[PDB]
């Protein structure tokens, strides 16, 4: 409907329908995140079944992946939202920003990833909440941080 021409103002390039399912069948890695809305949830749930999620492209009411606010989704989610994925172990690796940014803000960005990961205390946690938290740059630095401060 109108959201196929109103979500284009939020910064997305390829907005549409089952014509984008042919790009799923080709296995295009140009996209990394999939965002939809609850009216085209019959597209991904019936065509992008296996390739979407070891594809790991997300479409959840658990997360805010599919709201009906598709105009105001990618005004900040295309800009600064980094998605939390599960692992088989203890680890949840995320991504830090460009090296020449304000380093005082990133140390508060790491401090405000604490309130987001402790916002869900799954209530069946074990002994600790966070044991080891280390922020490396790409492949060289090793910076052991703390879970309390």
């Amino acid at each position: 409907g109108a959201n196929a021409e109103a979500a284009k103002a939020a910064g997305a390039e390829l907005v549409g329908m089952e014509d984008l399912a042919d790009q799923i069948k080709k296995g295009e890695m140009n996209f990394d995140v999939v965002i939809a809305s609850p009216d085209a949830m019959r597209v991904v749930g019936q065509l992008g079944q296996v390739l979407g999620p070891r594809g790991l492209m997300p479409n959840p009411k658990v997360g805010t992946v599919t709201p009906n606010v598709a105009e105001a989704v990618k005004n900040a989610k295309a800009g600064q939202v980094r998605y939390r994925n599960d692992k088989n172990g203890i680890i949840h690796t995320t991504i830090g920003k460009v090296d020449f940014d304000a380093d005082k803000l990133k140390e508060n960005l790491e401090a405000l990833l604490v309130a987001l990961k402790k916002a869900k205390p799954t209530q069946a946690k074990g002994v600790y909440i966070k044991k080891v938290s280390i922020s490396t740059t790409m492949g060289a630095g090793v910076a052991v941080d703390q879970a309390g401060l």
Partner: protein, 50 residues
């Protein structure tokens, strides 16, 4: 049963808070209403919490 309750924490320095009910499984985003504060006597925007 379905409609649980939330806590509107004031974003100002006071510890005053309003409380209300919000159905999480329909509109899962937070509320950013703008009501009166009886401590600061301002019109501070309130934020959603538990």
């Amino acid at each position: 049963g379905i409609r649980e309750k939330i806590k509107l924490v004031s974003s100002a320095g006071t510890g005053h808070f309003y409380t209300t009910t919000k159905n999480k499984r329909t509109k899962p985003e937070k509320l950013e209403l703008k009501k009166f504060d009886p401590v600061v006597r301002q019109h501070v925007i309130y934020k959603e919490a538990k």
